[PDB]
Amino acid sequence: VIAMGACTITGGMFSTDSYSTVRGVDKLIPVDVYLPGCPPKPEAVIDAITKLRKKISREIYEDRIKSQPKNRCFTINHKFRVGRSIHTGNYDQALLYKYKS
Amino acid sequence: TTRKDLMIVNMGPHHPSMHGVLRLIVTLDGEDVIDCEPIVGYLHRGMEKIAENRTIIQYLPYVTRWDYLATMFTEAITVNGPEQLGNIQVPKRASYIRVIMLELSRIASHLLWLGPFMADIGAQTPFFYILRERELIYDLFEAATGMRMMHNYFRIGGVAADLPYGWIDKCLDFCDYFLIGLTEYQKLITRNPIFLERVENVGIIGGEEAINWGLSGPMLRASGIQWDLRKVDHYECYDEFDWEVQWQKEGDSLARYLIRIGEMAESVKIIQQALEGIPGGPYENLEIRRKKPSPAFELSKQELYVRVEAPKGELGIFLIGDQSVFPWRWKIRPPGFINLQILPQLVKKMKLADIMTILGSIDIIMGEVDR
Amino acid sequence: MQGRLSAWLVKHGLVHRSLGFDYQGIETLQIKPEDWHSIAVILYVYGYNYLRSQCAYDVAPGGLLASVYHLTRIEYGVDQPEEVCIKVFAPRRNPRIPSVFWVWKSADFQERESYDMFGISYDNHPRLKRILMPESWIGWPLRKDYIVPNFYEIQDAY
Amino acid sequence: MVTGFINYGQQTIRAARYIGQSFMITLSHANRLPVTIQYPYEKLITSERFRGRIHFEFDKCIACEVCVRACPIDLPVVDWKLETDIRKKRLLNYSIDFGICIFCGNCVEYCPTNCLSMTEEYELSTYDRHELNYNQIALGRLPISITDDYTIRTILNSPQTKE
Amino acid sequence: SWEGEGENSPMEMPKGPPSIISALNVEKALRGIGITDVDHYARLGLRRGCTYDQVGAAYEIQVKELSSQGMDEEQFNKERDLLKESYNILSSEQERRLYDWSLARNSAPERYMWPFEADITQTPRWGTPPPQEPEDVGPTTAVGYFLLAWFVFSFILSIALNR
Ligand code: SF4
Ligand code: SF4
């Protein structure tokens, strides 16, 4: 994973007042190389890829067992309310009969 | 055939044809689109909320993040809302520079529309072909403004800085080269039999439907309507230059493609005319230019609506001030967000492979559809 | 001064209220929500082809919710088109405004945005659901007294 | 009936001609030189006003904090204390985190002492996010110009047009 | 505060032919109820969807030729007013828009028809578009001649080499 852009590292301009922007994908995915810059120059993207290659070439077989998930689980009943999907795919079909004055 | 025969596929945020993160819930009856439901908002950063609690000199970097292909149009609308509210005049040199930059951004936006459109049709080489010249446009912008995209060049009552030495001849040479490049594009693409047979009769839109749906720009102009907000509202200096509003009678995607090519040519003519008759004098307004604490632009207490002819249509700002630095309300009228709502009507009873052609005909980028 | 549209409405006996003009001199009229569905058709009958923008905004926190419509004409041979702003005010406790989707289709997405950001419910809109925010979201973000409920991925990148 | 076959003939030869035209237009680009800039063995010389990594002069800072207010996100951190002997603001720490920085140019434009400058130093990628929190020592380092690296071919975008 | 203006204005349609544009008529059109049983396209001889010159021509030939020839009494005068309604419905753009939309809604009330669909002024009339570049047809004939010569050479070669 390469986090390119300031909005992918820490949220960037939206780190302060956006109510829906995830402040960095390191909260979601493990990032190998962080690439700062708003529209980073394509040469800087190539440099980040070069650093990623520098880290990739250092890998051994032991790193493979660092990569498989541990896969722990815990299951309980929730007694929530189960509801069907709101977006069912029905759109603009028989629309002219949906006036309902 | 109502259910268990109709395949509901989520051609969603991660799809090569989906420009950005647009999602389509498409119901297919053997490669025939029964209907489609557009789901947007995967890029909704709440930019209208961030428009408040931010001064204009702070909000200007945020502006280029809607319509990131045509950034100067968003910057122009953001800087001409409050400068119309405060009755700030713009010098003639700054206005000419603004016209040149807007037309260059229109050229770049039409290019980077043509790329993904032909990619969705199936041709990948035109993407690199447009990028060869969009890099030159980026070089001109970086020489003038300082960055390729997110220029932060437009300012209230003028521009950030004057054009650097040796910019006029560079832009003229770019125009001379780009006319040849556009002729090469029309030679390669326009009469191709596969391109025509993929494009000739898809997405026929009536003029009345285009008016009612709120379409603008090349979408509305490709239905027999000669409606350009540069000539209607007398924006900047567009009344001084000789140019023609590109409109076509038929409603298909080929009309939109021809309109965008002709708009690129007319834009090039506008840069040539503007650079031939560039004026002198100042560029920043000396009246507004005045360790000490520095206030921002205090907006007046009245409502305002300002429009611009973006390459995707009409981009608008509805601004309500509060006699303070932070605006009370900042509503963005996005051309793509309104042009997108006609897509389920067009793709209905069409085929699966035609969805790419229809969606590439509409200039949709997802950073401007949501805010 | 009375606008052209206001003079036409008082000639045709349609109730309204003139709120003045913006900085460009475009007329601003206020329409009661109960009469808005009948007045929109008459507005199109006047000749307002183009629903340029539909917007909603907060008059004051804990106060009225205003829905804004911008209208103009698209016609051949007209030099200066006539544009009008029209505002419909609804209470915060239960905002209800009739939908103009059956007059201008351009409101189709836009009113949904007005429902997604401010919670103004539109009656005759056939597909009124959240468009920008996630479909399972609770709350209207653009209201002035909205408070974000402390999600982990919105907090500071530690 | 024959005219239908004739029209089929003329609307088939046209398609073959235009396919050959597309082939010729595309293959004429094989005689043209490549435009590719071979990074990292070749680097494009940045413009005179390219907005890259910030350079900060510690001696010229007065801790007036207008660079914080001009920032869209109030990013720069200016830790200062008052030197009571002279009652002037003494700077203790200055830090800009480049993971949040967008390089807009507001700080370098609204700084009254002009101690903040934009360099050409792009390519600031790091393996760790928290290594992007540059303090007043990292910001004070002089940028490495690509013209001083003699293992690469510096590419100029356009002729110098200084004649 | 203030008050809601234009509360029927206490005169509104003071004398003359009353306007067909009203809240009640519009509500009836929305619900799918015919707002006027009189066919204003009739009593003029016109067809549905006629243009704005035909309404005036029909007015002229119905008020000067057909009506004035019949009787000279004052019953003609009110009959003139009986025509003067329909023309004023079919000449003004707004009232005609309302009338055609009401007719379209009353015809098929189950399905909805927008006002722009029943309006005849929505058809675009902006002249001719700028023509697209002309086409080059010479290479088409060259390619066709090449393929025809190839086929004839194939025929001759097969016949000669088979023997
Ligand atoms: S504006 Fe300049 S002098 Fe003032 S605190 Fe910021 S860096 Fe220091
Ligand atoms: S360059 Fe812009 S975003 Fe970065 S620290 Fe300076 S003002 Fe803030």
PDB file of N, CA and C in Angstrom, chain B residues 131-172:
ATOM      1  N   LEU B 131      -2.452  13.336 -23.319  1.00  0.00           N
ATOM      2  CA  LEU B 131      -1.593  13.673 -22.191  1.00  0.00           C
ATOM      3  C   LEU B 131      -0.310  14.334 -22.661  1.00  0.00           C
ATOM      4  N   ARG B 132       0.121  14.013 -23.885  1.00  0.00           N
ATOM      5  CA  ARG B 132       1.286  14.663 -24.479  1.00  0.00           C
ATOM      6  C   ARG B 132       1.131  16.184 -24.541  1.00  0.00           C
ATOM      7  N   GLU B 133      -0.085  16.684 -24.772  1.00  0.00           N
ATOM      8  CA  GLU B 133      -0.329  18.122 -24.832  1.00  0.00           C
ATOM      9  C   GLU B 133      -0.885  18.700 -23.537  1.00  0.00           C
ATOM     10  N   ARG B 134      -1.585  17.897 -22.736  1.00  0.00           N
ATOM     11  CA  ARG B 134      -1.991  18.369 -21.420  1.00  0.00           C
ATOM     12  C   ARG B 134      -0.781  18.574 -20.522  1.00  0.00           C
ATOM     13  N   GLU B 135       0.311  17.847 -20.774  1.00  0.00           N
ATOM     14  CA  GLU B 135       1.554  18.137 -20.070  1.00  0.00           C
ATOM     15  C   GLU B 135       2.104  19.504 -20.463  1.00  0.00           C
ATOM     16  N   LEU B 136       1.953  19.895 -21.731  1.00  0.00           N
ATOM     17  CA  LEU B 136       2.359  21.239 -22.143  1.00  0.00           C
ATOM     18  C   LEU B 136       1.496  22.306 -21.480  1.00  0.00           C
ATOM     19  N   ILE B 137       0.190  22.049 -21.377  1.00  0.00           N
ATOM     20  CA  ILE B 137      -0.699  22.968 -20.664  1.00  0.00           C
ATOM     21  C   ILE B 137      -0.288  23.076 -19.197  1.00  0.00           C
ATOM     22  N   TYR B 138       0.051  21.939 -18.582  1.00  0.00           N
ATOM     23  CA  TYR B 138       0.549  21.930 -17.210  1.00  0.00           C
ATOM     24  C   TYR B 138       1.841  22.723 -17.084  1.00  0.00           C
ATOM     25  N   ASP B 139       2.721  22.617 -18.081  1.00  0.00           N
ATOM     26  CA  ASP B 139       3.972  23.370 -18.060  1.00  0.00           C
ATOM     27  C   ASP B 139       3.714  24.867 -18.127  1.00  0.00           C
ATOM     28  N   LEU B 140       2.772  25.287 -18.976  1.00  0.00           N
ATOM     29  CA  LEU B 140       2.402  26.700 -19.032  1.00  0.00           C
ATOM     30  C   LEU B 140       1.835  27.177 -17.699  1.00  0.00           C
ATOM     31  N   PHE B 141       0.955  26.376 -17.092  1.00  0.00           N
ATOM     32  CA  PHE B 141       0.359  26.755 -15.814  1.00  0.00           C
ATOM     33  C   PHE B 141       1.407  26.828 -14.708  1.00  0.00           C
ATOM     34  N   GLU B 142       2.336  25.871 -14.679  1.00  0.00           N
ATOM     35  CA  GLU B 142       3.379  25.871 -13.661  1.00  0.00           C
ATOM     36  C   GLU B 142       4.363  27.014 -13.867  1.00  0.00           C
ATOM     37  N   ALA B 143       4.620  27.393 -15.120  1.00  0.00           N
ATOM     38  CA  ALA B 143       5.444  28.566 -15.379  1.00  0.00           C
ATOM     39  C   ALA B 143       4.750  29.839 -14.917  1.00  0.00           C
ATOM     40  N   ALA B 144       3.431  29.918 -15.099  1.00  0.00           N
ATOM     41  CA  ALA B 144       2.694  31.121 -14.724  1.00  0.00           C
ATOM     42  C   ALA B 144       2.262  31.102 -13.258  1.00  0.00           C
ATOM     43  N   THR B 145       1.499  30.085 -12.857  1.00  0.00           N
ATOM     44  CA  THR B 145       0.916  30.052 -11.521  1.00  0.00           C
ATOM     45  C   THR B 145       1.838  29.451 -10.470  1.00  0.00           C
ATOM     46  N   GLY B 146       2.648  28.460 -10.832  1.00  0.00           N
ATOM     47  CA  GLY B 146       3.560  27.823  -9.902  1.00  0.00           C
ATOM     48  C   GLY B 146       3.304  26.352  -9.666  1.00  0.00           C
ATOM     49  N   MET B 147       2.151  25.830 -10.078  1.00  0.00           N
ATOM     50  CA  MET B 147       1.844  24.415  -9.936  1.00  0.00           C
ATOM     51  C   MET B 147       1.081  23.944 -11.166  1.00  0.00           C
ATOM     52  N   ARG B 148       1.127  22.632 -11.400  1.00  0.00           N
ATOM     53  CA  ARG B 148       0.397  22.048 -12.519  1.00  0.00           C
ATOM     54  C   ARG B 148      -1.106  22.147 -12.296  1.00  0.00           C
ATOM     55  N   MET B 149      -1.594  21.520 -11.234  1.00  0.00           N
ATOM     56  CA  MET B 149      -2.966  21.655 -10.778  1.00  0.00           C
ATOM     57  C   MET B 149      -2.952  22.300  -9.399  1.00  0.00           C
ATOM     58  N   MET B 150      -4.137  22.704  -8.936  1.00  0.00           N
ATOM     59  CA  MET B 150      -4.307  23.461  -7.692  1.00  0.00           C
ATOM     60  C   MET B 150      -3.411  24.699  -7.697  1.00  0.00           C
ATOM     61  N   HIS B 151      -3.702  25.580  -8.652  1.00  0.00           N
ATOM     62  CA  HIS B 151      -2.807  26.688  -8.962  1.00  0.00           C
ATOM     63  C   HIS B 151      -2.779  27.734  -7.856  1.00  0.00           C
ATOM     64  N   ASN B 152      -3.938  28.017  -7.251  1.00  0.00           N
ATOM     65  CA  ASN B 152      -4.102  29.112  -6.289  1.00  0.00           C
ATOM     66  C   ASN B 152      -3.647  30.438  -6.894  1.00  0.00           C
ATOM     67  N   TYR B 153      -4.001  30.647  -8.162  1.00  0.00           N
ATOM     68  CA  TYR B 153      -3.578  31.814  -8.925  1.00  0.00           C
ATOM     69  C   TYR B 153      -4.611  32.929  -8.935  1.00  0.00           C
ATOM     70  N   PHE B 154      -5.894  32.593  -9.025  1.00  0.00           N
ATOM     71  CA  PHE B 154      -6.922  33.621  -9.038  1.00  0.00           C
ATOM     72  C   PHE B 154      -7.099  34.213  -7.645  1.00  0.00           C
ATOM     73  N   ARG B 155      -7.286  35.527  -7.605  1.00  0.00           N
ATOM     74  CA  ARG B 155      -7.417  36.256  -6.355  1.00  0.00           C
ATOM     75  C   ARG B 155      -8.586  37.218  -6.477  1.00  0.00           C
ATOM     76  N   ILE B 156      -9.064  37.698  -5.330  1.00  0.00           N
ATOM     77  CA  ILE B 156     -10.146  38.672  -5.335  1.00  0.00           C
ATOM     78  C   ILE B 156      -9.620  40.007  -5.848  1.00  0.00           C
ATOM     79  N   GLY B 157     -10.326  40.580  -6.819  1.00  0.00           N
ATOM     80  CA  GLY B 157      -9.901  41.818  -7.440  1.00  0.00           C
ATOM     81  C   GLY B 157      -8.596  41.713  -8.203  1.00  0.00           C
ATOM     82  N   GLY B 158      -8.433  40.647  -8.982  1.00  0.00           N
ATOM     83  CA  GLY B 158      -7.236  40.484  -9.784  1.00  0.00           C
ATOM     84  C   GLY B 158      -6.712  39.064  -9.837  1.00  0.00           C
ATOM     85  N   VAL B 159      -5.387  38.917  -9.837  1.00  0.00           N
ATOM     86  CA  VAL B 159      -4.723  37.619  -9.856  1.00  0.00           C
ATOM     87  C   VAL B 159      -3.570  37.654  -8.861  1.00  0.00           C
ATOM     88  N   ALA B 160      -2.924  36.500  -8.687  1.00  0.00           N
ATOM     89  CA  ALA B 160      -1.828  36.401  -7.727  1.00  0.00           C
ATOM     90  C   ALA B 160      -0.615  37.202  -8.183  1.00  0.00           C
ATOM     91  N   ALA B 161      -0.212  37.032  -9.440  1.00  0.00           N
ATOM     92  CA  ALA B 161       0.965  37.710  -9.956  1.00  0.00           C
ATOM     93  C   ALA B 161       0.836  37.857 -11.464  1.00  0.00           C
ATOM     94  N   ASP B 162       1.646  38.753 -12.019  1.00  0.00           N
ATOM     95  CA  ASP B 162       1.646  38.979 -13.454  1.00  0.00           C
ATOM     96  C   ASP B 162       2.275  37.792 -14.180  1.00  0.00           C
ATOM     97  N   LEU B 163       2.021  37.724 -15.482  1.00  0.00           N
ATOM     98  CA  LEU B 163       2.593  36.663 -16.297  1.00  0.00           C
ATOM     99  C   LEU B 163       4.113  36.810 -16.350  1.00  0.00           C
ATOM    100  N   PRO B 164       4.859  35.711 -16.286  1.00  0.00           N
ATOM    101  CA  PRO B 164       6.320  35.808 -16.333  1.00  0.00           C
ATOM    102  C   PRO B 164       6.808  36.212 -17.715  1.00  0.00           C
ATOM    103  N   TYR B 165       8.068  36.636 -17.760  1.00  0.00           N
ATOM    104  CA  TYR B 165       8.678  37.051 -19.016  1.00  0.00           C
ATOM    105  C   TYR B 165       8.809  35.860 -19.957  1.00  0.00           C
ATOM    106  N   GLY B 166       8.454  36.067 -21.222  1.00  0.00           N
ATOM    107  CA  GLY B 166       8.504  34.992 -22.193  1.00  0.00           C
ATOM    108  C   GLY B 166       7.363  34.006 -22.110  1.00  0.00           C
ATOM    109  N   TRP B 167       6.178  34.454 -21.700  1.00  0.00           N
ATOM    110  CA  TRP B 167       5.018  33.575 -21.611  1.00  0.00           C
ATOM    111  C   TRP B 167       4.105  33.679 -22.826  1.00  0.00           C
ATOM    112  N   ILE B 168       4.011  34.867 -23.427  1.00  0.00           N
ATOM    113  CA  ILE B 168       3.102  35.080 -24.552  1.00  0.00           C
ATOM    114  C   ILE B 168       3.532  34.247 -25.753  1.00  0.00           C
ATOM    115  N   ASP B 169       4.827  34.285 -26.081  1.00  0.00           N
ATOM    116  CA  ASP B 169       5.326  33.521 -27.219  1.00  0.00           C
ATOM    117  C   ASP B 169       5.228  32.023 -26.966  1.00  0.00           C
ATOM    118  N   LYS B 170       5.466  31.594 -25.724  1.00  0.00           N
ATOM    119  CA  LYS B 170       5.327  30.182 -25.384  1.00  0.00           C
ATOM    120  C   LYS B 170       3.890  29.712 -25.562  1.00  0.00           C
ATOM    121  N   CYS B 171       2.923  30.520 -25.120  1.00  0.00           N
ATOM    122  CA  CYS B 171       1.520  30.151 -25.284  1.00  0.00           C
ATOM    123  C   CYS B 171       1.111  30.157 -26.755  1.00  0.00           C
ATOM    124  N   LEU B 172       1.632  31.107 -27.538  1.00  0.00           N
ATOM    125  CA  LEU B 172       1.328  31.138 -28.967  1.00  0.00           C
ATOM    126  C   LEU B 172       1.893  29.916 -29.686  1.00  0.00           C
TER     127      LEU B 172
END
